[PDB]
Write a protein that binds this ligand. Structure first.
Ligand code: ZN
Ligand code: ZN
Length: 83
């Protein structure tokens, strides 16, 4: 995230984090992270990959989260080049 002036986070589903939720893929109000290690316990959020949000990131061993189309639109609009 050092490529811009600030970090970027996404709110994690309180049902997914506590047990399960199957809607994050296209309908839930929050994000569903595959890599549970990316979730910050201090705020219930995941750091978002500024390469996928602006161009492309697809490496299965990434350091950040890649949101589904529904959530991703908010972060595509959240980027330094737009906001
Ligand atoms: Zn959910
Ligand atoms: Zn990435």
């Amino acid at each position: 995230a050092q490529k811009l002036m600030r970090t970027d986070r996404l709110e994690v589903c309180r049902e997914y984090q506590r047990g399960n939720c199957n809607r994050g893929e296209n309908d839930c109000r929050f994000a569903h992270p595959a890599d549970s290690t990316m979730i910050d316990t201090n705020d219930n959020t995941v750091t978002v990959c500024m390469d996928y949000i602006k161009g492309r990131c697809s490496r299965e061993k990434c350091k950040y989260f890649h949101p589904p189309a529904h959530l991703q639109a908010k972060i595509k609009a959240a980027q330094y080049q737009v906001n």
